[PDB]
Design a protein around this nucleic acid. Structure first.
Length: 94
RNA sequence: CGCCACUUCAUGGAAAUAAAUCACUCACGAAUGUCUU
């Protein structure tokens, strides 16, 4: 973990998401750059580059509670949506 | 823990449809109804 990061910046080290593996490494385009630490060999330390953080294709975003608005002039459609909406989100990922 | 990327870049439908297609006014008015030898 680089010990200089924005307060909203967090990492999931081992995840099934294996795209964007170049975001941590050697090249200057990487968001987090690993170089061999001084003194002791191995046990490299990481540096956070905010400029590369901005130009990342995908980010893991978690928000507070947010609203979903469904509009329909058909009352029976809305009431059927109300029954199935809690089940729909439980059964699906996005 | 180390190392490492490929793939995909628009199809289907609608392509004009109805309303009004000339309306009103003037449709001849005035002079001459014989004149001069």
């Amino acid at each position: 973990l680089p010990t200089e990061r924005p307060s909203n910046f967090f990492t999931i080290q081992n995840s099934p998401y294996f795209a964007q593996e170049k975001c941590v490494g050697i090249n200057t385009n990487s968001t987090i750059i690993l170089k061999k630490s001084n003194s002791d060999p191995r046990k490299k330390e990481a540096e956070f580059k905010e400029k590369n953080w901005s130009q990342i294709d995908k980010k893991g975003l978690e928000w507070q509670d947010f609203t979903i608005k469904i509009f329909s002039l058909k009352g029976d459609l809305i009431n059927k949506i109300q029954t199935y909406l809690p089940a729909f989100f439980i059964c699906h990922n996005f």
